[PDB]
């Protein structure tokens, strides 16, 4: 507990650490059902070792690692239909979303300086399904949120957004491509039309879905769901998270802006003295993001994505066969189970070694069918749950 | 450049990555003289591998890794003379400083809600030597900074701070234990007295110095410099950065608060739904911080710190012997060289394979004598610099 004068041997300290690691769950063991992280692609362990002693906060010392960040951003941009994207491989979707909010706020600040805004704080339309990082941004940056309601399919109400844009002076719109709770996709096509017609910045949070949606086989796509979400719609920025469905080690997050014109709105003016929030920051995230996308190609990511979707629809089928009520038919590799007693059922599952997460907008257990979840784990989950219900 | 359909082999992608890594500098090669990062302790490569697939954003899944974060914070707290510290192993000193600023701001918000503050924004006294992360915080959180001037020894003017606290309603004070530019130590003892007498929060930025000052041999200590900076002075929070002079891999930063009473001021209220800014975040930083401090003990860190100081004073001696003007006699393992033509000299050094950094408050080259800088590198640096000056 206290700092000691004498050191200890490598064997002593590693064995102590391994005992603590033994208390953790491991993704490959069939315990973790509620996480959007999973096992990393094995090749990334070598890449982390190669790039461990780099620092993208000092890119003049690590020119090659910096070029790899640029290449990683370019490959993500290509995936998102934008060959000119300006962006960064950052610490995660939270920092990515915060940087988009900073950009929105600095566009508003410039208007305020010119007398072109009656808003004392940026006014941003955000769906109530938005990830908690948006609340962190609101709280830090003193943003004003207009919370948009969701429709019966749990996607943002586009008519509300359009009406709010007419009623108020709006500084940004947020749409979500793959919501945290249910994996639904907002109508980005319509939101982007509203945004373009009114000269409003629009950010797409595709932290999870950005590395799933582009790879979905047609049989998993649903009539009337629009899967368009990327720069082909003219959106201003997109968050996308390699350390979720990109199989990259933490920290590997992505923020892409439509072009380099946005970089100036990420400036910070220091009277007595970088676009990311962090300073010193890893170089291995960009190396891993580039390398995993190159190693797998579209073919390899498609195989993983649709294996997850196969197991997602298997879980959905088994749930209904056992008279459980999924909240929705799954869109991405996320299924939620309606249950009034969800808190207690979650704890009972936990006692039996099944770790799910629980929802906010609805009383349900959330299962994220990442690549570590196999058929036998789903079968095991159903047995344990049936047993709890007797 | 573009996303491809077909993947590539492991050999192809690793060889490509290794070519980019070949363009980087490496700490052990005698090129990097201006960085506060260095080679990691070799044991940490194994720890990163063990803990790569953990996530302190989901500590309920990684109970052991979470306990190790708590143990890492406790060891840092013990080093800083506080057995009850509440804190986190975060992404770096930037996030640490931002969390301290969030705490300061939320203490002010509570006062504002009760009518106990005439300040429309928190008013924080910050020395002009403060790290750029404080400007990032000001810009994001709409803080009002009262910039404190520095004295001839480049430390904060304590009388200015005391006078400003009488003239204005002040919500926080920042002191620096190891400035970025010169390695000087503000008079934290006096600042903490001012802060306590006026009920003002005080944060100490010891990102660099916190893992140097406690280990300095008496011969490196200077008459009249006060080396006290930690919780024995009753300060409210301290930033300390293991991935600087703690030899830990990025990301390993530290933020410690005086006690768990501060946790409530890091809350974020989400109407429709964690104390760190990041969400998903590494677990290996806490494991490495704990393990390196246990492995080295005070004895092993003292040896490294004072080896760096030996080489720092060697560099200072050689500089004067060659008629260069150091800005100050070094306090920590940082030396700066006065030069009117510092920008051009820096570029000339760069052309010769010597990478220094350059200062803000003064026209000088900054050398950070990290453990990778040995006598032969200092001798080589002096030769190249003498040559540039002819």
From Swiss-Prot, chains A, B:
Cross-referenced InterPro entries, in alphabetical order?
GrpII_AminoAcid_Decarb (IPR050477), MfnA (IPR020931), PyrdxlP-dep_de-COase (IPR002129), PyrdxlP-dep_Trfase (IPR015424), PyrdxlP-dep_Trfase_major (IPR015421), PyrdxlP-dep_Trfase_small (IPR015422)
GO terms, biological process: carboxylic acid metabolic process; coenzyme A biosynthetic process; methanofuran biosynthetic process
* Key words, A-Z: Decarboxylase, Lyase, Pyridoxal phosphate
Q: How does activity depend on temperature?
A: Thermostable. Retains full tyrosine decarboxylase activity after heating at 100 degrees Celsius for 10 minutes and 42% of its activity after 10 minutes at 110 degrees Celsius. Inactive after 10 minutes at 121 degrees Celsius.
| Cofactor(s) it depends on | pyridoxal 5'-phosphate
Q: How does it assemble?
A: Homodimer.
Q: What does this protein do?
A: Catalyzes the decarboxylation of L-tyrosine to produce tyramine for methanofuran biosynthesis. Can also catalyze the decarboxylation of L-aspartate to produce beta-alanine for coenzyme A (CoA) biosynthesis.
How is this protein named in the record?
L-tyrosine/L-aspartate decarboxylase
Q: Which organism is it from?
A: Methanocaldococcus jannaschii (strain ATCC 43067 / DSM 2661 / JAL-1 / JCM 10045 / NBRC 100440) (Methanococcus jannaschii)
């Amino acid at each position: 507990r206290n700092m000691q004068e004498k050191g200890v041997s490598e064997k002593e300290i590693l064995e102590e650490l391994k005992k603590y690691r033994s208390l953790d769950l491991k993704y490959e063991d069939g315990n973790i059902f509620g996480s959007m992280c999973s096992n990393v692609l094995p090749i990334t362990r070598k890449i982390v070792d190669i790039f461990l002693e780099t620092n993208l906060g000092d890119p003049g010392l690590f020119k090659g690692t910096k070029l790899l960040e640029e290449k990683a951003v370019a490959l993500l941009g290509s995936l998102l239909n934008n060959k000119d994207a300006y962006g960064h491989i950052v610490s995660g979707g939270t920092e990515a979303n915060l940087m988009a909010l900073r950009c929105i706020k600095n566009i508003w600040r410039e208007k305020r300086r010119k007398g072109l805004s009656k808003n004392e704080h940026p006014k941003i339309i955000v769906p109530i399904t938005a990830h908690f990082s948006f609340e962190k941004g609101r709280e830090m940056m003193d943003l004003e949120y207009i919370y948009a309601p969701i429709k019966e399919d749990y996607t943002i109400d586009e008519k509300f957004v359009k009406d709010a844009v007419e009623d108020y002076d709006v500084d940004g719109i947020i749409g979500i491509a793959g919501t945290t709770e249910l994996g639904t996709i907002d109508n980005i096509e319509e939101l982007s039309k509203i945004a373009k017609e009114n000269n409003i910045y629009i950010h797409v949070d595709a932290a999870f879905g950005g590395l799933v949606i582009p790879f979905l086989d047609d049989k998993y796509k649903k009539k009337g769901v629009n899967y368009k979400f990327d720069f082909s719609l003219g959106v201003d920025s997109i968050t996308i998270d390699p350390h979720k469905m990109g199989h990259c080690p933490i920290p590997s997050g992505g923020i892409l802006f439509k072009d380099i014109g946005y970089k100036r709105y990420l400036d910070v003016d220091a009277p007595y003295l970088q676009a990311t929030i962090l300073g010193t920051r890893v170089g291995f995230g960009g190396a891993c993001t580039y390398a995993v996308l190159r190693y797998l190609g579209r073919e390899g990511q498609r195989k993983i994505v649709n294996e997850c979707m196969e197991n997602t629809l298997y879980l959905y089928k088994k749930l209904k066969e056992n008279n459980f009520k999924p909240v929705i038919e799954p869109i991405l590799n996320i299924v939620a189970i309606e249950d009034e007693d969800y808190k207690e059922v979650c704890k009972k599952l936990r006692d039996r070694g099944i770790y799910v997460s629980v929802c906010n907008c609805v009383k349900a257990l959330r299962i994220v069918v990442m690549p570590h979840i196999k058929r036998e784990h789903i079968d095991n989950f159903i047995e344990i749950l049936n047993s709890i219900k007797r």
